[PDB]
Symmetry: D2
Subunit: 179 residues, 4 copies
């Protein structure tokens, strides 16, 4: 469907900027038959660089000329049967930014907490097991919190944060839902 989606979106955009096959073809150094072919679903072998040139001439992005991620749901639902190890939970092309994980935190030395520099999106966390020592903000003088099982947290986009199990408690587990 990449080729098919591109074929449809290419035609819509070309029409939108009032170009006929010949007009777009000239700008790209192609023949109008070649542009007609792309709109007939034959664009599959176009390279990333060529797509960039086409988007440029059409004053838009490759993204605007390609289809959305797709649908992997079953009547609207998708299920997943069951120092840091990441256990990936269910994801879906219908909500690409959703990345939920069960994180096993195996280090219990807060001095050795390493900061993720911040995310582009928000994050919700729940302490599944053990006790977590969370740190955030400025790596040099961070905000901190000892979080027992059952505690929950929200971390806003771009806020640096790190986690370790509470000093000498061995290990802990968190569910992290980035969205």
């Amino acid at each position: 469907t990449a080729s098919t989606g591109f074929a449809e979106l290419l035609k819509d955009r070309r029409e939108q900027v009032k170009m006929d096959h010949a007009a777009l073809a000239s700008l790209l150094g192609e023949t109008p038959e070649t542009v007609a072919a792309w709109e007939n679903g034959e664009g599959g072998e176009l390279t990333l660089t060529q797509l960039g040139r086409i988007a440029h001439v059409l004053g838009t992005s490759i993204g605007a000329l390609t289809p959305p991620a797709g649908n992997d749901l079953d009547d609207g639902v998708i299920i997943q049967m069951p120092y840091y190890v990441y256990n990936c939970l269910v994801r879906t092309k219908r909500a690409p930014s959703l990345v939920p994980l069960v994180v096993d935190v195996l280090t219990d030395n807060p001095d050795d907490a390493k900061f993720n520099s911040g995310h582009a999106g928000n994050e919700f966390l729940f302490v599944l097991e053990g006790e977590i020592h969370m740190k955030w903000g400025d790596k040099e003088n961070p905000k901190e919190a000892l979080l027992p099982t059952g505690a929950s947290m929200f971390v806003e986009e771009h806020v640096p944060h790190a986690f370790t199990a509470a000093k000498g408690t061995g290990s802990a587990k968190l569910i992290a839902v980035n969205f």
Copy 2:
């Protein structure tokens, strides 16, 4: 800050549609001094109905004339210490649609599952304890799934769904994150 936010947004919108105090005042049956007062932060006693008239004359919504929810974060973070009972987890005015809950499911009779007709937003779920009998789609001939502890699910906006503990297992627990 409702009054202060309104004062600033009102002035910006009025200016945007090229109205001076007198022009807006006439349309509302008010004096220009009264409109000037609102822009000086004195709009706190305006009623919901009056706000609706002001938004109408300015061709916009009450929402466009009022401030965003606000910031309740501490350097970008907010934490919460620890047939259906809802245990509300952390929420934040910085991401209003985020509503995470620990749901105790106390009914284990799938025949008695009642369908939530669907949400405006998406939902992620994780089976915390026990085994869940999930149903979704058409209440009369639903899709179903038996989900053991550790299973995860995603439910798209407006998809009806219901949950019960697996037949005769007593009770179960889920973390539901609506966003």
Copy 3:
């Protein structure tokens, strides 16, 4: 669809979303549960801006999220308007509130008097209808350009700008579409 009726429906949606019953919400607002139920029955019209801000606050959201969209002033999808600076306001619509089109008669031809607009929320398209325009933008050390009749321009959000007719040319006219 009154302001009261829209609030009534959105208030109920949000209250249920955060799993509060009438009594729980009433306890946070200095009201009885019966009064909260009344609001949900369309009786919130007299609520003040200040009170609406508190309601939004305890529900962890904004007044905007609890009030209806601007409205629909269209006739099956369309709306038609018959026919130093004078602004002739063209058609506007509650279905696209940021759209503010204007025919601007520029009656000063002394660039030295161009007064800068601090920038807009939103983009802007301009088209010179008559005369010659002396345009200025950026840092009020501004960039400058002479725009003859038929010239068109795009100014991105927040870019400050100002204009007059070209020196000693008398007057000019342009159409400015903010969107």
Copy 4:
């Protein structure tokens, strides 16, 4: 900022977001991990549309999410263009791709020949510059209106529309701004 360079950065962001290393991602694409690392070093320019669709698929997202925005063709926030139907394309910008302004010369004055546009993704503002326009919209049982010089109109997304000059009036001219 090449298409290759943008893809390189976004691919790496996404791969890390779903916690896959080079080897894990390589195993889903029929490539070696060294080749995946090369793409992240800017060497993906020859990747085909088909291959990009597969990459997006295994990463649970869209080609759009893995490719750069349209780009910036502005000069400190602005871009300027000097000066049956003939379309004179006015200024456009990659910073607002949906903006397509045009001066349309309408050379047919027989309403019977108005050919309907199935509707647009996006809104549209129109202003009659010369002559009289016979506008049609909705169900190609259409609504109709005569628009004299100076009239303005707004047509919402997806509403089909068509126009000619008013019967026997020769020709007309309008400016159409799609945004």
